[PDB]
Design an enzyme around this catalytic site. Sequence first.
Site, PDB file in Angstrom:
ATOM      1  N   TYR A  57      -5.132   4.547  10.683  1.00 53.08           N
ATOM      2  CA  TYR A  57      -4.166   3.642  10.058  1.00 53.08           C
ATOM      3  C   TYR A  57      -3.988   4.039   8.571  1.00 53.08           C
ATOM      4  O   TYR A  57      -3.632   3.207   7.752  1.00 53.08           O
ATOM      5  CB  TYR A  57      -4.589   2.144  10.242  1.00 53.08           C
ATOM      6  CG  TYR A  57      -6.068   1.918   9.954  1.00 53.08           C
ATOM      7  CD1 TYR A  57      -6.505   1.462   8.703  1.00 53.08           C
ATOM      8  CD2 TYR A  57      -7.043   2.260  10.917  1.00 53.08           C
ATOM      9  CE1 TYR A  57      -7.874   1.284   8.435  1.00 53.08           C
ATOM     10  CE2 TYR A  57      -8.398   2.128  10.636  1.00 53.08           C
ATOM     11  CZ  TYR A  57      -8.801   1.636   9.386  1.00 53.08           C
ATOM     12  OH  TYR A  57     -10.150   1.548   9.131  1.00 53.08           O
ATOM     13  N   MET A  66      -6.142   8.472   3.549  1.00 56.02           N
ATOM     14  CA  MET A  66      -6.910   7.581   2.671  1.00 56.02           C
ATOM     15  C   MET A  66      -7.827   6.649   3.468  1.00 56.02           C
ATOM     16  O   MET A  66      -7.544   5.463   3.589  1.00 56.02           O
ATOM     17  CB  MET A  66      -6.001   6.776   1.726  1.00 56.02           C
ATOM     18  CG  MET A  66      -4.715   6.445   2.327  1.00 56.02           C
ATOM     19  SD  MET A  66      -3.766   5.296   1.342  1.00 56.02           S
ATOM     20  CE  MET A  66      -4.721   3.766   1.649  1.00 56.02           C
ATOM     21  N   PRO A  67      -8.951   7.176   4.002  1.00 56.79           N
ATOM     22  CA  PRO A  67      -9.816   6.371   4.882  1.00 56.79           C
ATOM     23  C   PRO A  67     -10.360   5.115   4.152  1.00 56.79           C
ATOM     24  O   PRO A  67     -10.799   5.209   2.986  1.00 56.79           O
ATOM     25  CB  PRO A  67     -10.978   7.317   5.204  1.00 56.79           C
ATOM     26  CG  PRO A  67     -10.603   8.661   4.682  1.00 56.79           C
ATOM     27  CD  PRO A  67      -9.518   8.501   3.693  1.00 56.79           C
ATOM     28  N   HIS A  68     -10.272   3.967   4.810  1.00 55.51           N
ATOM     29  CA  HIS A  68     -10.767   2.687   4.291  1.00 55.51           C
ATOM     30  C   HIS A  68     -10.976   1.666   5.425  1.00 55.51           C
ATOM     31  O   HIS A  68     -10.596   1.890   6.583  1.00 55.51           O
ATOM     32  CB  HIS A  68      -9.814   2.090   3.272  1.00 55.51           C
ATOM     33  CG  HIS A  68      -8.491   1.713   3.848  1.00 55.51           C
ATOM     34  ND1 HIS A  68      -7.559   2.646   4.258  1.00 55.51           N
ATOM     35  CD2 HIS A  68      -7.944   0.504   4.097  1.00 55.51           C
ATOM     36  CE1 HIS A  68      -6.501   2.028   4.746  1.00 55.51           C
ATOM     37  NE2 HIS A  68      -6.718   0.725   4.680  1.00 55.51           N
ATOM     38  N   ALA A  69     -11.604   0.549   5.077  1.00 53.80           N
ATOM     39  CA  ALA A  69     -11.798  -0.575   5.964  1.00 53.80           C
ATOM     40  C   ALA A  69     -11.574  -1.838   5.098  1.00 53.80           C
ATOM     41  O   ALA A  69     -11.311  -1.726   3.902  1.00 53.80           O
ATOM     42  CB  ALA A  69     -13.196  -0.529   6.527  1.00 53.80           C
TER      43      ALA A  69
END
Lengths: 156, 156
Positions: A57, A66-69
Amino acid sequence: MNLAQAFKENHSIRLGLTAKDWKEAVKLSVTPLIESGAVKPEYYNAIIESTESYGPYYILMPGMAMPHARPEAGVQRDAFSLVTLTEPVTFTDGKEVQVLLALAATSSKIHTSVAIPQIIALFELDHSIERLVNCKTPEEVLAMVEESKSSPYLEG
Amino acid sequence: MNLAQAFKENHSIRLGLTAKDWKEAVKLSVTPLIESGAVKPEYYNAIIESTESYGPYYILMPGMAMPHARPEAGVQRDAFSLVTLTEPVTFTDGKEVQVLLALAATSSKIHTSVAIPQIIALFELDHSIERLVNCKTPEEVLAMVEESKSSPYLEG
């Protein structure tokens, strides 16, 4: 948080790394932020579980992620990292990635109004992916960050 | 959700409106989505309360705002509206706005990976603010939405 200062404080620019797959690429981008204490260790498992369950996502444009949670998955403080690979890796949706800018935001408000404009400024420089990939030292990347500062995204 | 189809289904393109202030401008942009049932009525109070407590967290570039709140504040389904004013209004941080694109997302994942890329494609057309403001009919705005589709943000 400003990109340059996050990068310096977190020592989170790590260049010319090799990953065999997407899960490794993701590990590499978040690890610097676990080491600095920007995020709890679980932040990593969260990105992977979210990715597996939802698909990527965070692949804003081709070549970059832009990896994140969510903040609740273990963000202590706002921070960024930047990792470049020597070869692209393929994510689950068929998308190829060579540059990873991991993002830790303490709220959706700062994700949207503070973090994303700065990320998009960087990546809209000319040949931003190709230039990021040819960076040898953190100082080179930060020279690029300086040059992004005349973006309209950055005016407010 | 795709911008064009959201706009058509929600009849949420309303052009050449007059607002005296920022709270009115915000009301105008969300009302079309309350009427269609994309959002509950409370979505409005939420944007205003969040704005008052935090400042504008959605003015991506000068001239435009994408007013929104968390999914939990009454989003039923993913949707967008677009409102243009006849004169700018000033938000609390000194920022002037003439175009409002309200956003309803059912999760942060779709906010980031689906909604924002489409919004930024629209606004990166040449003279996008000036052209949006000179639109008389929804069909004109949608012709602009078509033209945004060759953005790199839209490739995946």
